[PDB]
Scaffold this active site. Structure first.
Site, PDB file in Angstrom:
ATOM      1  N   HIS A  41      39.484   8.948  26.744  1.00  0.00           N
ATOM      2  CA  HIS A  41      39.651   8.456  28.107  1.00  0.00           C
ATOM      3  C   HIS A  41      38.919   9.235  29.213  1.00  0.00           C
ATOM      4  O   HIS A  41      39.024   8.851  30.369  1.00  0.00           O
ATOM      5  CB  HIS A  41      41.128   8.181  28.464  1.00  0.00           C
ATOM      6  CG  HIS A  41      41.938   9.407  28.759  1.00  0.00           C
ATOM      7  ND1 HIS A  41      43.108   9.698  28.091  1.00  0.00           N
ATOM      8  CD2 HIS A  41      41.763  10.404  29.659  1.00  0.00           C
ATOM      9  CE1 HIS A  41      43.608  10.830  28.557  1.00  0.00           C
ATOM     10  NE2 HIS A  41      42.806  11.282  29.505  1.00  0.00           N
ATOM     11  N   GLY A 143      45.250  17.223  35.151  1.00  0.00           N
ATOM     12  CA  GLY A 143      44.131  18.034  34.656  1.00  0.00           C
ATOM     13  C   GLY A 143      44.400  18.769  33.354  1.00  0.00           C
ATOM     14  O   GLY A 143      43.586  19.597  32.928  1.00  0.00           O
ATOM     15  N   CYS A 145      44.942  17.195  30.298  1.00  0.00           N
ATOM     16  CA  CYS A 145      44.538  16.445  29.083  1.00  0.00           C
ATOM     17  C   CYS A 145      43.497  17.172  28.284  1.00  0.00           C
ATOM     18  O   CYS A 145      42.637  17.836  28.842  1.00  0.00           O
ATOM     19  CB  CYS A 145      44.042  15.063  29.410  1.00  0.00           C
ATOM     20  SG  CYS A 145      45.368  14.006  29.806  1.00  0.00           S
TER      21      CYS A 145
HETATM   22  C1  LIG Z   1      41.968  14.777  35.672  1.00  0.00           C
HETATM   23  C2  LIG Z   1      41.779  13.446  34.966  1.00  0.00           C
HETATM   24  O1  LIG Z   1      41.873  13.588  33.542  1.00  0.00           O
HETATM   25  C3  LIG Z   1      43.109  14.033  32.898  1.00  0.00           C
HETATM   26  O2  LIG Z   1      43.204  15.210  32.567  1.00  0.00           O
HETATM   27  C4  LIG Z   1      44.242  13.055  32.659  1.00  0.00           C
HETATM   28  C5  LIG Z   1      45.511  13.816  32.268  1.00  0.00           C
HETATM   29  C6  LIG Z   1      46.812  13.033  32.418  1.00  0.00           C
HETATM   30  C7  LIG Z   1      48.051  13.761  31.910  1.00  0.00           C
HETATM   31  C8  LIG Z   1      49.307  13.890  32.895  1.00  0.00           C
HETATM   32  C9  LIG Z   1      49.275  14.610  34.245  1.00  0.00           C
HETATM   33  C10 LIG Z   1      50.795  14.728  34.608  1.00  0.00           C
HETATM   34  N1  LIG Z   1      51.423  14.874  33.312  1.00  0.00           N
HETATM   35  C11 LIG Z   1      50.578  14.571  32.402  1.00  0.00           C
HETATM   36  O3  LIG Z   1      50.779  14.772  31.223  1.00  0.00           O
HETATM   37  N2  LIG Z   1      46.743  11.801  31.623  1.00  0.00           N
HETATM   38  C12 LIG Z   1      46.729  10.615  32.243  1.00  0.00           C
HETATM   39  O4  LIG Z   1      46.764  10.526  33.466  1.00  0.00           O
HETATM   40  C13 LIG Z   1      46.676   9.368  31.394  1.00  0.00           C
HETATM   41  C14 LIG Z   1      45.237   8.856  31.321  1.00  0.00           C
HETATM   42  C15 LIG Z   1      45.118   7.520  30.612  1.00  0.00           C
HETATM   43  C16 LIG Z   1      44.040   6.713  30.748  1.00  0.00           C
HETATM   44  C17 LIG Z   1      42.858   7.069  31.615  1.00  0.00           C
HETATM   45  C18 LIG Z   1      43.995   5.404  30.019  1.00  0.00           C
HETATM   46  C19 LIG Z   1      47.608   8.296  31.976  1.00  0.00           C
HETATM   47  C20 LIG Z   1      49.016   8.796  32.262  1.00  0.00           C
HETATM   48  O5  LIG Z   1      49.443   9.815  31.741  1.00  0.00           O
HETATM   49  C21 LIG Z   1      49.901   8.002  33.190  1.00  0.00           C
HETATM   50  N3  LIG Z   1      51.053   7.500  32.448  1.00  0.00           N
HETATM   51  C22 LIG Z   1      51.258   6.210  32.175  1.00  0.00           C
HETATM   52  O6  LIG Z   1      50.501   5.305  32.522  1.00  0.00           O
HETATM   53  C23 LIG Z   1      52.518   5.926  31.396  1.00  0.00           C
HETATM   54  C24 LIG Z   1      52.184   5.630  29.931  1.00  0.00           C
HETATM   55  O7  LIG Z   1      51.282   4.519  29.802  1.00  0.00           O
HETATM   56  N4  LIG Z   1      53.229   4.753  31.898  1.00  0.00           N
HETATM   57  C25 LIG Z   1      54.036   4.781  32.966  1.00  0.00           C
HETATM   58  O8  LIG Z   1      54.265   5.805  33.599  1.00  0.00           O
HETATM   59  O9  LIG Z   1      54.691   3.535  33.383  1.00  0.00           O
HETATM   60  C26 LIG Z   1      54.230   2.674  34.450  1.00  0.00           C
HETATM   61  C27 LIG Z   1      52.762   2.282  34.247  1.00  0.00           C
HETATM   62  C28 LIG Z   1      55.073   1.400  34.431  1.00  0.00           C
HETATM   63  C29 LIG Z   1      54.420   3.363  35.804  1.00  0.00           C
HETATM   64  C30 LIG Z   1      50.486   8.810  34.364  1.00  0.00           C
HETATM   65  C31 LIG Z   1      49.471   9.717  35.054  1.00  0.00           C
HETATM   66  C32 LIG Z   1      51.121   7.890  35.407  1.00  0.00           C
END
Ligand SMILES: CCOC(=O)CC[C@H](C[C@@H]1CCNC1=O)NC(=O)[C@H](CC=C(C)C)CC(=O)[C@@H](NC(=O)[C@H](CO)NC(=O)OC(C)(C)C)C(C)C
Ligand SMILES: CCOC(=O)CC[C@H](C[C@@H]1CCNC1=O)NC(=O)[C@H](CC=C(C)C)CC(=O)[C@@H](NC(=O)[C@H](CO)NC(=O)OC(C)(C)C)C(C)C
Lengths: 301, 301
Positions: A41, A143, A145
């Protein structure tokens, strides 16, 4: 007589952490030899989060679509592929810090250490268990992931987890280093929720053995139980059913303490039914389920 | 929404751990540049444990009385002195892995990470607090002496603790890297016992701020309190008195959450007087006192 959740020393893994950027998305990756692993992702953008076609999204990228930083030093991507929910980036340099290592898929109940990282920089380490519902009660901010989970035994690093998402309840979901998800989760922002969780019976029992090896016997009793009678109390208190395999695993700890497993199960059943009344086991006011029988041995060396 | 006791990543400290042997006594030492630090009680033997004269015991030793191993590689002692309860061994090589570092004496309530080591080999890491009674609720087995505690901020390692002994209650006592003991303890096997401990009020409050920044507000109330009225409930529940300095330290967390300190103190007083009734704060069924206000900021980045 003191007893802590101990994490493996994180050095061997710190040396493998890198930053991976693609567009305006940065996250962590794992650099072993001349490969960098990271959540696929990284390649997603604002809109295509709820419905990404990773095959379609990846064909549009080249080796210079990916910026990879070890320290402030840059690494050149010279090839790339997607393996399940992970990207595998080939780079021009082999990590001079690559430890001896393996990839393992752990089972629920097993424990491991997580090195929480932000933008390729290690920030904290803590010990975790894979819950029966295939999530982890971790601690991950924006941040985080690409942060990994691992065990270490005599300088061999077994990687077992890479972080991908937080679920609505605040718990965390991710993949092995293949990276197939643990649990029924997918790397798309949809309505997915953790299933109902259960207490890890085998670990509670292990930890009660640790309390005795550590000197404390207050919760023990004169009774015994059958497996089936135990599993009825278990079912009511939302504990996993005990199996004969679990009883066998508790063999060594049972022999060392001279307490029969089903006698310990009687002790636990009494703790469940009567509570702990103001008292503590190994410092705790609750029944701890995140130490395995293997964890107990190692920390009661 | 998940919240763990996080330890600093241990790499920079792992690279400094060595084994120190003198007679039939082996323990851990810390190798920074061309100096190795370790508990002076390496030089003691069976009998002279209850009453050692370290000056007398040390004058009888030479540079080859001390065997020092980094990995399996041997290091040559080329000089030695005693500083308070520590030995300072000069060796022929500067540690090529010496991080940027400092020595700090921490105050009670402050937290740090410990790298538990056996025979110069790192085995586990965990986060600790210096208790008001100058002990730590650590986890140390036979062969753990010389293990260090530290904080890290942007690649500077602040060493603050070296382990020396376990007290009768199972708690641990040691020194700064000067090494003057924390607390009224001495490195002789006598009748010493930890004094009565107290809960760290400032940390409980910090952690209640973390719960709110993390989304949870259930324990809050409409009341306020005065410092003095709070300190009366504190005294009864064995909490440290709150001071104006503590109230000031909680300034930033108070501003960020919009909850006044003395209002949070009202909330805490209500938690103390009424219990938690089946509910949890940040996963816990008890009031946590081993996260500082600084810890809260960092983990609520
Ligand atoms: C800086 C950009 O890169 C990263 O590092 C991303 C790290 C974070 C991990 C997060 C941060 C807070 N806690 C975590 O573990 N991961 C994500 O945001 C994930 C990336 C997924 C993609 C792009 C398809 C998505 C999620 O973790 C997101 N979670 C969800 O969408 C969850 C599970 O699907 N669903 C959910 O919360 O329900 C809703 C949609 C009805 C509100 C949250 C940030 C809201
Ligand atoms: C391998 C040999 O070298 C080492 O690494 C030593 C590490 C351990 C630390 C221990 C191990 C278990 N938990 C620990 O922290 N430290 C010690 O044993 C200390 C060495 C002190 C000397 C030589 C003057 C002594 C102690 O910690 C000992 N503790 C005491 O004597 C304490 C405090 O004085 N007193 C005490 O327990 O009360 C009695 C004497 C009335 C029973 C215990 C092992 C019983």
């Amino acid at each position: 007589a003191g007893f802590r959740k101990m994490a493996f020393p994180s050095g061997k893994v710190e040396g493998c952490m890198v930053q991976v950027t693609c567009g305006t998305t940065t996250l962590n990756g794992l650099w072993l030899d001349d490969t960098v692993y990271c959540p696929r992702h990284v390649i997603c953008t604002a809109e295509d989060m709820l419905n990404p076609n990773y095959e379609d999204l990846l064909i549009r990228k080249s080796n210079h679509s990916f910026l990879v930083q070890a320290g402030n030093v840059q690494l050149r991507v010279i090839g790339h592929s997607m393996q399940n929910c992970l990207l595998r980036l080939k780079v021009d340099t082999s990590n001079p810090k690559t430890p001896k290592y393996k990839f393992v898929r752990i089972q629920p109940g097993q424990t491991f250490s997580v090195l929480a990282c932000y933008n390729g920089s290690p920030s904290g380490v803590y010990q975790c268990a894979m819950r029966p519902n295939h999530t982890i009660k971790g601690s991950f901010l924006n941040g985080s992931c690409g942060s990994v989970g691992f065990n270490i035994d005599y300088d061999c690093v077994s990687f077992c987890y890479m972080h991908h998402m937080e679920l609505p309840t605040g718990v965390h979901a991710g993949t092995d280093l293949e990276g197939k998800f643990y649990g029924p989760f997918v790397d798309r922002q949809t309505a997915q929720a953790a299933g109902t969780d259960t207490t890890i019976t085998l670990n509670v029992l292990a930890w009660l053995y640790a309390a005795v090896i550590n000197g404390d016997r207050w919760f023990l009793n004169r009774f015994t139980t059958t497996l089936n009678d135990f599993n009825l109390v278990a079912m009511k208190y939302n504990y996993e059913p005990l199996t004969q395999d679990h009883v066998d695993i508790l063999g060594p700890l049972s022999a060392q303490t001279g307490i029969a497993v089903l006698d310990m199960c009687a002790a636990l059943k009494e703790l469940l039914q009567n509570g702990m009344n103001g008292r503590t086991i190994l410092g705790s006011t609750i029944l701890e389920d995140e130490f395995t029988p293997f964890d107990v041995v190692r920390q009661c060396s």
